[PDB]
């Protein structure tokens, strides 16, 4: 089998992407944030504290003839940005772009933190990291991909995120029309439960490529590109007036600037992030100070190839017995 679904930016800055997901019988369609950096499929629901729901579409398990309470199971998750959610668990039928999993753990939120409440466009998350990170207790549950894998034509999914435009998540096949040149594959460590890999270096604008190993994670659920302070300083030094602002929480730059591109290495291959992808707009409405899309990972404890990087590529998440990651230009 295969599946194919369009993923759509939630706003004009590509702060996140939402993909429609069918849950239950009859289908209840929720728009979920597909997150290769976590491993829980959780939804706003009829069980979510009412004051914490503000515009989201909810899953109502009592209206699904295939929903079953997973007795005794609870979940609770905290994300890198400090947001969180928790609740109980149902199993139900979940379909993405025509690909159907029966008995998928659907984690129903009883509580969500303010950032979730305040984002009316995201109805939940669909985790695509390794199932070892799933938070369901006392019996850990499998991701949608892990459940689908054996049925797929090939044990892969691909992320093709757009810049200020829709893109595509495919399951079970590689669309050879969706990229240019070849896909370069690179080794993955699953030891921390992430799609963790090592970039071979970087360049800033038309500058020379610096060969250096940068370990980090391919994370569709993180907006920005988080890299070591040395790398980030080298980038922003090429933007007149750019500076790190402790009050704002990162590098900012004059909105009048033209940003240079940023290149990262995948083996001997190179992915080029155009400068415009690195502009996240005014820090506050009407400001002429703009927020940068490349930020320091210092104090995160891990480098993160988030949407800023991934959207410059066609990305293969290869879930073969030994997983690997592939990157192509597009």
PDB file of N, CA, C and O in Angstrom, residues 16-78:
ATOM      1  N   UNK A  16       4.489  26.240  10.825  1.00  0.00           N
ATOM      2  CA  UNK A  16       4.287  24.805  10.932  1.00  0.00           C
ATOM      3  C   UNK A  16       3.438  24.404   9.741  1.00  0.00           C
ATOM      4  O   UNK A  16       2.958  25.277   9.008  1.00  0.00           O
ATOM      5  N   UNK A  17       3.270  23.098   9.550  1.00  0.00           N
ATOM      6  CA  UNK A  17       2.502  22.547   8.451  1.00  0.00           C
ATOM      7  C   UNK A  17       1.459  21.599   9.006  1.00  0.00           C
ATOM      8  O   UNK A  17       1.735  20.844   9.937  1.00  0.00           O
ATOM      9  N   UNK A  18       0.274  21.629   8.415  1.00  0.00           N
ATOM     10  CA  UNK A  18      -0.807  20.735   8.808  1.00  0.00           C
ATOM     11  C   UNK A  18      -1.223  19.829   7.663  1.00  0.00           C
ATOM     12  O   UNK A  18      -1.265  20.254   6.503  1.00  0.00           O
ATOM     13  N   UNK A  19      -1.575  18.593   8.013  1.00  0.00           N
ATOM     14  CA  UNK A  19      -1.921  17.547   7.070  1.00  0.00           C
ATOM     15  C   UNK A  19      -3.224  16.937   7.551  1.00  0.00           C
ATOM     16  O   UNK A  19      -3.336  16.583   8.722  1.00  0.00           O
ATOM     17  N   UNK A  20      -4.216  16.792   6.654  1.00  0.00           N
ATOM     18  CA  UNK A  20      -5.488  16.220   7.095  1.00  0.00           C
ATOM     19  C   UNK A  20      -5.347  14.727   7.358  1.00  0.00           C
ATOM     20  O   UNK A  20      -4.687  14.024   6.579  1.00  0.00           O
ATOM     21  N   UNK A  21      -5.967  14.268   8.445  1.00  0.00           N
ATOM     22  CA  UNK A  21      -5.920  12.882   8.892  1.00  0.00           C
ATOM     23  C   UNK A  21      -7.338  12.444   9.227  1.00  0.00           C
ATOM     24  O   UNK A  21      -8.062  13.154   9.934  1.00  0.00           O
ATOM     25  N   UNK A  22      -7.745  11.297   8.697  1.00  0.00           N
ATOM     26  CA  UNK A  22      -9.058  10.729   8.981  1.00  0.00           C
ATOM     27  C   UNK A  22      -8.974   9.787  10.181  1.00  0.00           C
ATOM     28  O   UNK A  22      -8.174   8.844  10.177  1.00  0.00           O
ATOM     29  N   UNK A  23      -9.802  10.032  11.190  1.00  0.00           N
ATOM     30  CA  UNK A  23      -9.811   9.226  12.415  1.00  0.00           C
ATOM     31  C   UNK A  23     -11.218   8.728  12.656  1.00  0.00           C
ATOM     32  O   UNK A  23     -12.164   9.507  12.684  1.00  0.00           O
ATOM     33  N   UNK A  24     -11.359   7.423  12.858  1.00  0.00           N
ATOM     34  CA  UNK A  24     -12.638   6.872  13.268  1.00  0.00           C
ATOM     35  C   UNK A  24     -13.596   6.524  12.150  1.00  0.00           C
ATOM     36  O   UNK A  24     -13.296   6.676  10.968  1.00  0.00           O
ATOM     37  N   UNK A  25     -14.772   6.049  12.549  1.00  0.00           N
ATOM     38  CA  UNK A  25     -15.819   5.612  11.630  1.00  0.00           C
ATOM     39  C   UNK A  25     -17.176   6.111  12.141  1.00  0.00           C
ATOM     40  O   UNK A  25     -17.582   5.776  13.251  1.00  0.00           O
ATOM     41  N   UNK A  26     -17.870   6.948  11.361  1.00  0.00           N
ATOM     42  CA  UNK A  26     -17.398   7.596  10.130  1.00  0.00           C
ATOM     43  C   UNK A  26     -16.176   8.472  10.395  1.00  0.00           C
ATOM     44  O   UNK A  26     -15.887   8.848  11.530  1.00  0.00           O
ATOM     45  N   UNK A  27     -15.458   8.816   9.341  1.00  0.00           N
ATOM     46  CA  UNK A  27     -14.239   9.579   9.490  1.00  0.00           C
ATOM     47  C   UNK A  27     -14.505  10.917  10.159  1.00  0.00           C
ATOM     48  O   UNK A  27     -15.467  11.609   9.849  1.00  0.00           O
ATOM     49  N   UNK A  28     -13.594  11.273  11.052  1.00  0.00           N
ATOM     50  CA  UNK A  28     -13.483  12.617  11.606  1.00  0.00           C
ATOM     51  C   UNK A  28     -12.146  13.135  11.115  1.00  0.00           C
ATOM     52  O   UNK A  28     -11.104  12.549  11.418  1.00  0.00           O
ATOM     53  N   UNK A  29     -12.158  14.198  10.320  1.00  0.00           N
ATOM     54  CA  UNK A  29     -10.924  14.718   9.744  1.00  0.00           C
ATOM     55  C   UNK A  29     -10.370  15.835  10.614  1.00  0.00           C
ATOM     56  O   UNK A  29     -11.051  16.834  10.875  1.00  0.00           O
ATOM     57  N   UNK A  30      -9.142  15.629  11.091  1.00  0.00           N
ATOM     58  CA  UNK A  30      -8.410  16.599  11.901  1.00  0.00           C
ATOM     59  C   UNK A  30      -7.135  16.963  11.157  1.00  0.00           C
ATOM     60  O   UNK A  30      -6.561  16.150  10.432  1.00  0.00           O
ATOM     61  N   UNK A  31      -6.707  18.204  11.329  1.00  0.00           N
ATOM     62  CA  UNK A  31      -5.483  18.685  10.689  1.00  0.00           C
ATOM     63  C   UNK A  31      -4.331  18.607  11.679  1.00  0.00           C
ATOM     64  O   UNK A  31      -4.298  19.357  12.663  1.00  0.00           O
ATOM     65  N   UNK A  32      -3.415  17.662  11.438  1.00  0.00           N
ATOM     66  CA  UNK A  32      -2.372  17.349  12.405  1.00  0.00           C
ATOM     67  C   UNK A  32      -1.018  17.851  11.920  1.00  0.00           C
ATOM     68  O   UNK A  32      -0.745  17.942  10.719  1.00  0.00           O
ATOM     69  N   UNK A  33      -0.166  18.151  12.888  1.00  0.00           N
ATOM     70  CA  UNK A  33       1.212  18.561  12.632  1.00  0.00           C
ATOM     71  C   UNK A  33       2.077  17.305  12.640  1.00  0.00           C
ATOM     72  O   UNK A  33       2.312  16.712  13.691  1.00  0.00           O
ATOM     73  N   UNK A  34       2.520  16.880  11.458  1.00  0.00           N
ATOM     74  CA  UNK A  34       3.376  15.705  11.338  1.00  0.00           C
ATOM     75  C   UNK A  34       4.776  16.045  11.849  1.00  0.00           C
ATOM     76  O   UNK A  34       5.422  16.969  11.336  1.00  0.00           O
ATOM     77  N   UNK A  35       5.222  15.299  12.851  1.00  0.00           N
ATOM     78  CA  UNK A  35       6.402  15.672  13.626  1.00  0.00           C
ATOM     79  C   UNK A  35       7.411  14.525  13.679  1.00  0.00           C
ATOM     80  O   UNK A  35       7.263  13.594  14.481  1.00  0.00           O
ATOM     81  N   UNK A  36       8.452  14.606  12.848  1.00  0.00           N
ATOM     82  CA  UNK A  36       9.493  13.575  12.853  1.00  0.00           C
ATOM     83  C   UNK A  36      10.410  13.649  14.077  1.00  0.00           C
ATOM     84  O   UNK A  36      11.323  12.822  14.205  1.00  0.00           O
ATOM     85  N   UNK A  37      10.159  14.614  14.966  1.00  0.00           N
ATOM     86  CA  UNK A  37      10.857  14.720  16.228  1.00  0.00           C
ATOM     87  C   UNK A  37      10.125  14.201  17.463  1.00  0.00           C
ATOM     88  O   UNK A  37      10.615  14.356  18.579  1.00  0.00           O
ATOM     89  N   UNK A  38       8.966  13.576  17.295  1.00  0.00           N
ATOM     90  CA  UNK A  38       8.267  12.958  18.423  1.00  0.00           C
ATOM     91  C   UNK A  38       7.478  11.762  17.926  1.00  0.00           C
ATOM     92  O   UNK A  38       7.430  11.511  16.727  1.00  0.00           O
ATOM     93  N   UNK A  39       6.854  11.040  18.849  1.00  0.00           N
ATOM     94  CA  UNK A  39       6.339   9.716  18.536  1.00  0.00           C
ATOM     95  C   UNK A  39       4.954   9.425  19.101  1.00  0.00           C
ATOM     96  O   UNK A  39       4.589   8.262  19.260  1.00  0.00           O
ATOM     97  N   UNK A  40       4.196  10.484  19.383  1.00  0.00           N
ATOM     98  CA  UNK A  40       2.822  10.366  19.864  1.00  0.00           C
ATOM     99  C   UNK A  40       1.879  10.962  18.817  1.00  0.00           C
ATOM    100  O   UNK A  40       2.165  12.022  18.245  1.00  0.00           O
ATOM    101  N   UNK A  41       0.766  10.283  18.573  1.00  0.00           N
ATOM    102  CA  UNK A  41      -0.317  10.811  17.765  1.00  0.00           C
ATOM    103  C   UNK A  41      -1.370  11.232  18.775  1.00  0.00           C
ATOM    104  O   UNK A  41      -2.007  10.382  19.404  1.00  0.00           O
ATOM    105  N   UNK A  42      -1.491  12.539  18.998  1.00  0.00           N
ATOM    106  CA  UNK A  42      -2.446  13.049  19.976  1.00  0.00           C
ATOM    107  C   UNK A  42      -3.325  14.109  19.344  1.00  0.00           C
ATOM    108  O   UNK A  42      -2.906  14.804  18.409  1.00  0.00           O
ATOM    109  N   UNK A  43      -4.547  14.195  19.851  1.00  0.00           N
ATOM    110  CA  UNK A  43      -5.563  15.073  19.289  1.00  0.00           C
ATOM    111  C   UNK A  43      -6.336  15.849  20.339  1.00  0.00           C
ATOM    112  O   UNK A  43      -6.584  15.360  21.447  1.00  0.00           O
ATOM    113  N   UNK A  44      -6.726  17.061  19.979  1.00  0.00           N
ATOM    114  CA  UNK A  44      -7.801  17.751  20.674  1.00  0.00           C
ATOM    115  C   UNK A  44      -9.033  16.862  20.589  1.00  0.00           C
ATOM    116  O   UNK A  44      -9.284  16.220  19.557  1.00  0.00           O
ATOM    117  N   UNK A  45      -9.806  16.818  21.665  1.00  0.00           N
ATOM    118  CA  UNK A  45     -10.907  15.886  21.711  1.00  0.00           C
ATOM    119  C   UNK A  45     -12.067  16.413  22.538  1.00  0.00           C
ATOM    120  O   UNK A  45     -11.989  17.476  23.168  1.00  0.00           O
ATOM    121  N   UNK A  46     -13.141  15.633  22.550  1.00  0.00           N
ATOM    122  CA  UNK A  46     -14.298  15.920  23.381  1.00  0.00           C
ATOM    123  C   UNK A  46     -13.953  15.842  24.870  1.00  0.00           C
ATOM    124  O   UNK A  46     -14.744  16.273  25.704  1.00  0.00           O
ATOM    125  N   UNK A  47     -12.780  15.290  25.191  1.00  0.00           N
ATOM    126  CA  UNK A  47     -12.315  15.185  26.572  1.00  0.00           C
ATOM    127  C   UNK A  47     -11.413  16.352  26.972  1.00  0.00           C
ATOM    128  O   UNK A  47     -11.073  16.489  28.142  1.00  0.00           O
ATOM    129  N   UNK A  48     -11.010  17.183  26.017  1.00  0.00           N
ATOM    130  CA  UNK A  48     -10.122  18.301  26.337  1.00  0.00           C
ATOM    131  C   UNK A  48     -10.849  19.351  27.176  1.00  0.00           C
ATOM    132  O   UNK A  48     -11.946  19.793  26.826  1.00  0.00           O
ATOM    133  N   UNK A  49     -10.217  19.744  28.281  1.00  0.00           N
ATOM    134  CA  UNK A  49     -10.713  20.826  29.123  1.00  0.00           C
ATOM    135  C   UNK A  49     -11.251  21.965  28.254  1.00  0.00           C
ATOM    136  O   UNK A  49     -10.530  22.505  27.421  1.00  0.00           O
ATOM    137  N   UNK A  50     -12.512  22.332  28.455  1.00  0.00           N
ATOM    138  CA  UNK A  50     -13.200  23.220  27.526  1.00  0.00           C
ATOM    139  C   UNK A  50     -12.504  24.572  27.358  1.00  0.00           C
ATOM    140  O   UNK A  50     -12.411  25.089  26.247  1.00  0.00           O
ATOM    141  N   UNK A  51     -12.011  25.138  28.455  1.00  0.00           N
ATOM    142  CA  UNK A  51     -11.337  26.435  28.401  1.00  0.00           C
ATOM    143  C   UNK A  51     -10.023  26.390  27.626  1.00  0.00           C
ATOM    144  O   UNK A  51      -9.446  27.434  27.318  1.00  0.00           O
ATOM    145  N   UNK A  52      -9.544  25.183  27.330  1.00  0.00           N
ATOM    146  CA  UNK A  52      -8.282  25.009  26.611  1.00  0.00           C
ATOM    147  C   UNK A  52      -8.487  24.715  25.130  1.00  0.00           C
ATOM    148  O   UNK A  52      -7.520  24.508  24.399  1.00  0.00           O
ATOM    149  N   UNK A  53      -9.744  24.683  24.699  1.00  0.00           N
ATOM    150  CA  UNK A  53     -10.078  24.539  23.284  1.00  0.00           C
ATOM    151  C   UNK A  53     -10.515  25.904  22.749  1.00  0.00           C
ATOM    152  O   UNK A  53     -11.405  26.541  23.327  1.00  0.00           O
ATOM    153  N   UNK A  54      -9.884  26.365  21.667  1.00  0.00           N
ATOM    154  CA  UNK A  54     -10.210  27.658  21.059  1.00  0.00           C
ATOM    155  C   UNK A  54     -10.118  27.579  19.529  1.00  0.00           C
ATOM    156  O   UNK A  54      -9.171  28.062  18.918  1.00  0.00           O
ATOM    157  N   UNK A  55     -11.107  26.946  18.919  1.00  0.00           N
ATOM    158  CA  UNK A  55     -11.194  26.900  17.469  1.00  0.00           C
ATOM    159  C   UNK A  55     -10.753  25.612  16.812  1.00  0.00           C
ATOM    160  O   UNK A  55     -11.013  25.421  15.632  1.00  0.00           O
ATOM    161  N   UNK A  56     -10.078  24.736  17.554  1.00  0.00           N
ATOM    162  CA  UNK A  56      -9.614  23.469  16.992  1.00  0.00           C
ATOM    163  C   UNK A  56     -10.787  22.546  16.685  1.00  0.00           C
ATOM    164  O   UNK A  56     -11.839  22.603  17.319  1.00  0.00           O
ATOM    165  N   UNK A  57     -10.589  21.679  15.706  1.00  0.00           N
ATOM    166  CA  UNK A  57     -11.492  20.570  15.470  1.00  0.00           C
ATOM    167  C   UNK A  57     -11.144  19.452  16.435  1.00  0.00           C
ATOM    168  O   UNK A  57      -9.974  19.135  16.614  1.00  0.00           O
ATOM    169  N   UNK A  58     -12.165  18.870  17.051  1.00  0.00           N
ATOM    170  CA  UNK A  58     -11.963  17.839  18.051  1.00  0.00           C
ATOM    171  C   UNK A  58     -12.376  16.474  17.536  1.00  0.00           C
ATOM    172  O   UNK A  58     -13.295  16.348  16.727  1.00  0.00           O
ATOM    173  N   UNK A  59     -11.676  15.464  18.040  1.00  0.00           N
ATOM    174  CA  UNK A  59     -12.046  14.070  17.897  1.00  0.00           C
ATOM    175  C   UNK A  59     -13.009  13.697  19.020  1.00  0.00           C
ATOM    176  O   UNK A  59     -12.715  13.933  20.188  1.00  0.00           O
ATOM    177  N   UNK A  60     -14.134  13.089  18.663  1.00  0.00           N
ATOM    178  CA  UNK A  60     -15.108  12.629  19.645  1.00  0.00           C
ATOM    179  C   UNK A  60     -15.185  11.106  19.545  1.00  0.00           C
ATOM    180  O   UNK A  60     -15.867  10.557  18.674  1.00  0.00           O
ATOM    181  N   UNK A  61     -14.473  10.397  20.429  1.00  0.00           N
ATOM    182  CA  UNK A  61     -14.454   8.937  20.261  1.00  0.00           C
ATOM    183  C   UNK A  61     -15.823   8.279  20.399  1.00  0.00           C
ATOM    184  O   UNK A  61     -16.030   7.245  19.783  1.00  0.00           O
ATOM    185  N   UNK A  62     -16.741   8.862  21.167  1.00  0.00           N
ATOM    186  CA  UNK A  62     -18.057   8.261  21.360  1.00  0.00           C
ATOM    187  C   UNK A  62     -18.853   8.217  20.053  1.00  0.00           C
ATOM    188  O   UNK A  62     -19.815   7.459  19.943  1.00  0.00           O
ATOM    189  N   UNK A  63     -18.458   9.023  19.072  1.00  0.00           N
ATOM    190  CA  UNK A  63     -19.136   9.039  17.773  1.00  0.00           C
ATOM    191  C   UNK A  63     -18.474   8.126  16.742  1.00  0.00           C
ATOM    192  O   UNK A  63     -18.924   8.038  15.597  1.00  0.00           O
ATOM    193  N   UNK A  64     -17.405   7.452  17.142  1.00  0.00           N
ATOM    194  CA  UNK A  64     -16.714   6.524  16.259  1.00  0.00           C
ATOM    195  C   UNK A  64     -17.014   5.091  16.646  1.00  0.00           C
ATOM    196  O   UNK A  64     -16.714   4.667  17.760  1.00  0.00           O
ATOM    197  N   UNK A  65     -17.573   4.333  15.710  1.00  0.00           N
ATOM    198  CA  UNK A  65     -17.976   2.963  15.990  1.00  0.00           C
ATOM    199  C   UNK A  65     -16.782   2.021  16.088  1.00  0.00           C
ATOM    200  O   UNK A  65     -16.926   0.885  16.534  1.00  0.00           O
ATOM    201  N   UNK A  66     -15.608   2.486  15.677  1.00  0.00           N
ATOM    202  CA  UNK A  66     -14.396   1.674  15.750  1.00  0.00           C
ATOM    203  C   UNK A  66     -13.468   2.095  16.907  1.00  0.00           C
ATOM    204  O   UNK A  66     -12.426   1.483  17.134  1.00  0.00           O
ATOM    205  N   UNK A  67     -13.835   3.135  17.650  1.00  0.00           N
ATOM    206  CA  UNK A  67     -13.014   3.563  18.778  1.00  0.00           C
ATOM    207  C   UNK A  67     -13.152   2.602  19.949  1.00  0.00           C
ATOM    208  O   UNK A  67     -14.242   2.153  20.266  1.00  0.00           O
ATOM    209  N   UNK A  68     -12.039   2.309  20.605  1.00  0.00           N
ATOM    210  CA  UNK A  68     -12.063   1.519  21.823  1.00  0.00           C
ATOM    211  C   UNK A  68     -11.109   2.146  22.828  1.00  0.00           C
ATOM    212  O   UNK A  68      -9.962   2.444  22.503  1.00  0.00           O
ATOM    213  N   UNK A  69     -11.579   2.351  24.053  1.00  0.00           N
ATOM    214  CA  UNK A  69     -10.714   2.862  25.100  1.00  0.00           C
ATOM    215  C   UNK A  69      -9.600   1.862  25.343  1.00  0.00           C
ATOM    216  O   UNK A  69      -9.845   0.670  25.469  1.00  0.00           O
ATOM    217  N   UNK A  70      -8.368   2.340  25.397  1.00  0.00           N
ATOM    218  CA  UNK A  70      -7.238   1.493  25.757  1.00  0.00           C
ATOM    219  C   UNK A  70      -7.132   1.557  27.275  1.00  0.00           C
ATOM    220  O   UNK A  70      -6.644   2.530  27.848  1.00  0.00           O
ATOM    221  N   UNK A  71      -7.642   0.521  27.926  1.00  0.00           N
ATOM    222  CA  UNK A  71      -7.900   0.576  29.347  1.00  0.00           C
ATOM    223  C   UNK A  71      -6.642   0.822  30.152  1.00  0.00           C
ATOM    224  O   UNK A  71      -5.653   0.099  30.010  1.00  0.00           O
ATOM    225  N   UNK A  72      -6.687   1.840  31.006  1.00  0.00           N
ATOM    226  CA  UNK A  72      -5.588   2.127  31.911  1.00  0.00           C
ATOM    227  C   UNK A  72      -4.463   2.961  31.333  1.00  0.00           C
ATOM    228  O   UNK A  72      -3.550   3.356  32.057  1.00  0.00           O
ATOM    229  N   UNK A  73      -4.516   3.234  30.036  1.00  0.00           N
ATOM    230  CA  UNK A  73      -3.405   3.907  29.362  1.00  0.00           C
ATOM    231  C   UNK A  73      -3.529   5.419  29.487  1.00  0.00           C
ATOM    232  O   UNK A  73      -4.603   5.993  29.276  1.00  0.00           O
ATOM    233  N   UNK A  74      -2.417   6.062  29.811  1.00  0.00           N
ATOM    234  CA  UNK A  74      -2.338   7.517  29.833  1.00  0.00           C
ATOM    235  C   UNK A  74      -1.095   7.955  29.073  1.00  0.00           C
ATOM    236  O   UNK A  74      -0.213   7.155  28.770  1.00  0.00           O
ATOM    237  N   UNK A  75      -1.030   9.241  28.778  1.00  0.00           N
ATOM    238  CA  UNK A  75       0.127   9.800  28.096  1.00  0.00           C
ATOM    239  C   UNK A  75       0.355  11.210  28.594  1.00  0.00           C
ATOM    240  O   UNK A  75      -0.561  11.859  29.095  1.00  0.00           O
ATOM    241  N   UNK A  76       1.590  11.673  28.450  1.00  0.00           N
ATOM    242  CA  UNK A  76       1.972  13.010  28.863  1.00  0.00           C
ATOM    243  C   UNK A  76       3.276  13.349  28.179  1.00  0.00           C
ATOM    244  O   UNK A  76       4.239  12.590  28.273  1.00  0.00           O
ATOM    245  N   UNK A  77       3.307  14.477  27.481  1.00  0.00           N
ATOM    246  CA  UNK A  77       4.467  14.817  26.672  1.00  0.00           C
ATOM    247  C   UNK A  77       4.826  16.269  26.879  1.00  0.00           C
ATOM    248  O   UNK A  77       3.952  17.111  27.120  1.00  0.00           O
ATOM    249  N   UNK A  78       6.124  16.545  26.809  1.00  0.00           N
ATOM    250  CA  UNK A  78       6.634  17.912  26.835  1.00  0.00           C
ATOM    251  C   UNK A  78       7.560  18.080  25.646  1.00  0.00           C
ATOM    252  O   UNK A  78       8.393  17.215  25.376  1.00  0.00           O
TER     253      UNK A  78
END
